[PDB]
């Protein structure tokens, strides 16, 4: 019969690993605040990806050295029987940077370990990086053959380039709350880019900041989907 190769092969024995780095408490000398509500995010992600049949590994309060070593070790594993790879980063951040408990780590350093040439058992497979962290300090006021080494990566950023990312101390972050809700409802129905578009809408319409500080009050947020994927991604098969 006629065959179409438009979607990633997601019927390998395992869906893959879902590494969640949950950084809540930071070393006093860094001057970084405690990320209240991040445990709600980590727990929501653990349950969401468990139901998607991913082998979830939750890591709490890792130093910059521990983050690099974890990523290196995970990239050196045999992922031949795995369909994909997911890494969720929950921490403080700047543009292109994620914070370890004792200091910064370049996002490029983390993602480079999974390049098509550096992690052979993941070549041609989707590598998803979900990042809940700030990408700067701007506030949104609102209104109304061979394959590339950078191919097959998807970066689901919580916020637009140069902007702050919002996290609620009780409910968790706007992005992760929305991501988990949309994956629970649409993972058995829609393609990943379409699920992420629903997350963009949810964060954009359902949330607005409340603060006694006028500078941080009534602010909005829009996530940023960055795709270097070459095929469509469906969490289901058959």
């Amino acid at each position: 019969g006629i065959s179409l190769d438009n979607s990633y092969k997601m019927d390998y024995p395992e869906m893959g690993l879902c590494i969640i780095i949950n950084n809540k408490n930071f070393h006093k000398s860094t001057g970084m605040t405690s990320r209240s509500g991040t445990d709600v995010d980590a727990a929501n992600l653990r349950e969401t990806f468990r139901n998607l049949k991913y082998e979830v590994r939750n890591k709490n309060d890792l130093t910059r050295e521990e983050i690099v070593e974890l990523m290196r070790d995970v990239s050196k594993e045999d992922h031949s029987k795995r369909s994909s790879f997911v890494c969720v980063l929950l921490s403080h951040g700047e543009e292109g940077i994620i914070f370890g408990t004792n200091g910064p780590v370049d996002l490029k350093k983390i993602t480079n370990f999974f390049r098509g040439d550096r992690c052979r058992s993941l070549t041609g497979k989707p590598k998803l990086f979900i990042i809940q962290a700030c990408r700067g300090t701007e506030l949104d006021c609102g209104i109304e053959h061979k394959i590339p080494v950078e191919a097959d990566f998807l970066y689901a950023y919580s916020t637009a380039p140069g902007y702050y990312s919002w996290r609620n101390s009780k409910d968790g972050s706007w992005f992760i709350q929305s991501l988990c809700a949309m994956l629970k409802q649409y993972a058995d129905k829609l393609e990943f880019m379409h699920i992420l578009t629903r997350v963009n809408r949810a964060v954009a319409t359902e949330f607005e900041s409340f603060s006694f500080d006028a500078t941080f009050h009534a602010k909005k947020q829009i996530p940023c989907i960055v795709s270097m994927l070459t095929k469509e991604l469906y969490f289901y098969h058959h």
């Binding site: 605040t33 921490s91 702050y164 919002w166 996290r167 609620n168 101390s169 941080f216």
Partner: peptide, 4 residues
């Protein structure tokens, strides 16, 4: 609400 807090920022990261």
């Amino acid at each position: 609400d807090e920022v990261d």
